[PDB]
């Protein structure tokens, strides 16, 4: 589909200098929204919707953490040169453009409706997300590391976190959900490196 | 062997109520010392020596202090706080003797690291008495099972094979990655977890 992309009215700091964008279809029979695919979820599970937005959008916003020092200082009043080297480094480590952050939000909502125990999504949400990522398959959502089926009750606050299959890549394809344990075990390795690692370790331990 | 164990002079908070003990062999000449097996290392690798002492004795508060109850903590040590700091301090509590044991084991491991300096005869003979012959480059990640190098100590962490067990048999070194990965699982549970993970991914 083609998206609205019209500027969404906001009282956000970012909104004073940059636009939040309409994510409704270009056609669009109402008021223009940033997170339409989350409306039902916000109605049924407020903290899950909010956690999806936060993990998709925040570190300050990831699409602010990508802006250069001059723009931070002048338009947001952030003197990066004041902060110690390490916090500048970590801030940059979390950077992602605006569209990517929204993409991630969409992916995570799509995964969430396929959790065991998930609410049933309305037809708009279902069709909109399915258009992006394919048919929803009930109960298919697993830990990206564990490969264990996740239940929505886990998201209750955590025990579940947002995962990046390959380190430092913030887009729809690369994200999912993971047990806290599995997510911290993976650390700075990609999935394939992590599995390869486990394989070598076990080989070694089975020797002697 | 038989150990000195006479009180060692300290300006420490613990020492006003409990002793620091000589760990030289009983009837030693010279002054009595708590960490004799570490003086040589402290000369060339003070950071490593310091890490060994911290990991063996500390939790902020010593492990052998944290094995004492709140009443003695307010009375003897004059210490009332959040719960996830309190029981978290309780978690890693161990007897003073076990702590020193851990320090011995860690030093014995350190002298067997690739690139390790060579121990002096006192240190070598003393530690080998407790743990057996040092063999060069034998020190491996407790988890990875790969050989460790001394330059990793600029990372490496002290590992516990079984959680909640601070003794010589149970401790070793581990790459930072391997050690955080293990989290709160024993070694066997961690390997078993890996096997389940690989089994599931090979099916997909």
Numbering used by the authors:
A (entry chain A): 1 to 59, 74 to 171, 177 to 227
B (entry chain C): 1 to 59, 73 to 92, 96 to 170, 178 to 227
Sentences from the paper on this structure:
DraIII is a type IIP restriction endonucleases (REases) that recognizes and creates a double strand break within the gapped palindromic sequence CAC↑NNN↓GTG of double-stranded DNA (↑ indicates nicking on the bottom strand; ↓ indicates nicking on the top strand). DraIII is a type IIP REase isolated from Deinococcus radiophilus ATCC 27603. However, wild type DraIII shows significant star activity. It indicated, as supported by mutagenesis, that DraIII possesses a ββα-metal HNH active site.
The structure of DraIII was determined in the presence of an 11-bp canonical DNA duplex containing a phosphorothioate at both of the scissile phosphodiester bonds. A complete protein structure was derived from a protein-phosphorothioate DNA duplex in the presence of magnesium chloride, although the DNA was not observed in the structure. DraIII exists as a homodimer and dimerization occurs in the C-terminus region where the ββα-metal HNH active site is located. Two zinc- and one magnesium-binding sites are found in each DraIII monomer. The DraIII monomer contains a ββα-metal fold (β1-β2-α12) in the C-terminal domain where the HNH active site is located. The N-terminal zinc binding site (consisting of C4, C22, H28 and C32) and the C-terminal zinc binding site (C157, C160, H198 and C201) of DraIII deviate from the CXXC/CXXC configuration. The DraIII structure is composed of two domains: the N-terminal domain (α1–9) and the C-terminal domain (α10–13, β1–2). More importantly, the domain interface opens up to the active site tunnel the substrate DNA would bind to (surface mode). Six potential hydrogen bonds are found between the two domains along the domain interface, which can be divided into three regions: the mouth, middle and hinge region. Among the known HNH REases, the structure presented here is the first for one that recognizes a gapped sequence.
